[PDB]
C-alpha cells in the first residue's frame, strides 16, 4: 500500500435484516438499509453507497444476490470516475466478492482484484451515529463521500493514519462501549461536526492507540 490507487471494498453490510419472533412463534425477517464501504487507505477517502431496501424488491436469496449488487455498484462508481481517478487494485474484504467483481469488471483490464485476510470491520461504522443514522433513515439509494482520516494527514503519514483507523474500527467491533470511552479521554473531548473521530492531542492519541490495541488483544 501507499504508492497506485487502491480501494478496499467491504460488502458485509449490504444485505441487513431484522429478525423478530412473532406472537405466533415464527421468525419474520425484514430487510433494512445497508451500505457498501469503498475505501482508499492512502488518502482516507470513503465512498459510502447506501443500499435502500427498494433494491431487493421482487428478489430472492438476497444474501447471495447482495454480492452481485455490490459488484454492480462498484463498477458503476468506476465508470462515473475519470480514468485518472479509477483504482489500479481492488482488495475485497470477503472472498465471495471475487467472482462477481471479476465479471462486472471485464471492461477494466487495468484493474487487479484480490482478496485479503486483513481484519477491516467497516461494520463498526454502523455504530458511529453519523453513519448509522444516515443509513437507517435513507429513503432511496445514494452515495456519500467521507474523509475517514479527518485532519490527521496534516501531521502523520498515511501508514500511521491507516493503522490508527484500523485500531479504532477493530476496537469498536470487539467492544463498542469500551472503545467509545477510550476515545473520550476527557469530559471536554469533542468531535468537530465535519469530522468522524475526536479532536485529540498527539499524546492523547498515543495512549488511545495502546488502549485500543489492548482491547482488541483482550477480545
Ligand atoms: Cl505512508
Ligand atoms: Co441495476
Ligand atoms: Co477537518
From Swiss-Prot:
Residues 1-219 are annotated as: RNase H homology domain. Changing residue 17 to D: Strongly reduced interaction with RNA. It is found in: Nucleus; Nucleus speckle. Widely expressed. It comes from the Eukaryota. Part of the U5 snRNP complex. Component of the U4/U6-U5 tri-snRNP complex composed of the U4, U6 and U5 snRNAs and at least PRPF3, PRPF4, PRPF6, PRPF8, PRPF31, SNRNP200, TXNL4A, SNRNP40, DDX23, CD2BP2, PPIH, SNU13, EFTUD2, SART1 and USP39. Component of the U5.U4atac/U6atac snRNP complexes in U12-dependent spliceosomes. Within the minor spliceosome, which acts on U12-type introns, interacts with PPIL2 and RBM48. Core component of U2-type precatalytic, catalytic and postcatalytic spliceosomal complexes. Found in a mRNA splicing-dependent exon junction complex (EJC) with SRRM1. Plays a role in pre-mRNA splicing as core component of precatalytic, catalytic and postcatalytic spliceosomal complexes, both of the predominant U2-type spliceosome and the minor U12-type spliceosome. Functions as a scaffold that mediates the ordered assembly of spliceosomal proteins and snRNAs. Required for the assembly of the U4/U6-U5 tri-snRNP complex, a building block of the spliceosome. Functions as a scaffold that positions spliceosomal U2, U5 and U6 snRNAs at splice sites on pre-mRNA substrates, so that splicing can occur. Interacts with both the 5' and the 3' splice site. It is linked to Retinitis pigmentosa 13: A retinal dystrophy belonging to the group of pigmentary retinopathies. Retinitis pigmentosa is characterized by retinal pigment deposits visible on fundus examination and primary loss of rod photoreceptor cells followed by secondary loss of cone photoreceptors. Patients typically have night vision blindness and loss of midperipheral visual field. As their condition progresses, they lose their far peripheral visual field and eventually central vision as well. The MPN (JAB/Mov34) domain mediates interaction with TSSC4 and SNRNP200. Has structural similarity with deubiquitinating enzymes, but lacks the residues that would bind the catalytic metal ion. This is Pre-mRNA-processing-splicing factor 8. It comes from Homo sapiens (Human). The chain holds residues 1771 to 1990 of 2335 of the full protein.
Amino acid at each position: 500500500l501507499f504508492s497506485q490507487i487502491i480501494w478496499f471494498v467491504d460488502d458485509t453490510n449490504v444485505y441487513r435484516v431484522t429478525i423478530h419472533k412473532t406472537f405466533e412463534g415464527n421468525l419474520t425477517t425484514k430487510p433494512i438499509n445497508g451500505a457498501i464501504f469503498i475505501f482508499n487507505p492512502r488518502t482516507g477517502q470513503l465512498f459510502l453507497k447506501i443500499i435502500h431496501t427498494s433494491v431487493w424488491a421482487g428478489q430472492k436469496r438476497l444474501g447471495q444476490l447482495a454480492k452481485w449488487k455490490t459488484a454492480e455498484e462498484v463498477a458503476a462508481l468506476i465508470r462515473s470516475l475519470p480514468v485518472e481517478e479509477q483504482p489500479k487494485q481492488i482488495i475485497v474484504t470477503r472472498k465471495g466478492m471475487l467472482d462477481p467483481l471479476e465479471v462486472h469488471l471485464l471492461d477494466f483490464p487495468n484493474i487487479v482484484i484480490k482478496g485479503s485476510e486483513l481484519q477491516l470491520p467497516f461494520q463498526a461504522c454502523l455504530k458511529v451515529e453519523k453513519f448509522g443514522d444516515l443509513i437507517l433513515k435513507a429513503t432511496e439509494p445514494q452515495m456519500v463521500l467521507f474523509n475517514l482520516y479527518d485532519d490527521w494527514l496534516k501531521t502523520i503519514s498515511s501508514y500511521t493514519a491507516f493503522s490508527r483507523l484500523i485500531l479504532i474500527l477493530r476496537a469498536l467491533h470487539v467492544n463498542n462501549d469500551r472503545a467509545k470511552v477510550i476515545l473520550k479521554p476527557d469530559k471536554t473531548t469533542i468531535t468537530e461536526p465535519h469530522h468522524i473521530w475526536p479532536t485529540l492531542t498527539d499524546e492523547e492519541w498515543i495512549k488511545v492507540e495502546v488502549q485500543l490495541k489492548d482491547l482488541i488483544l483482550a477480545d
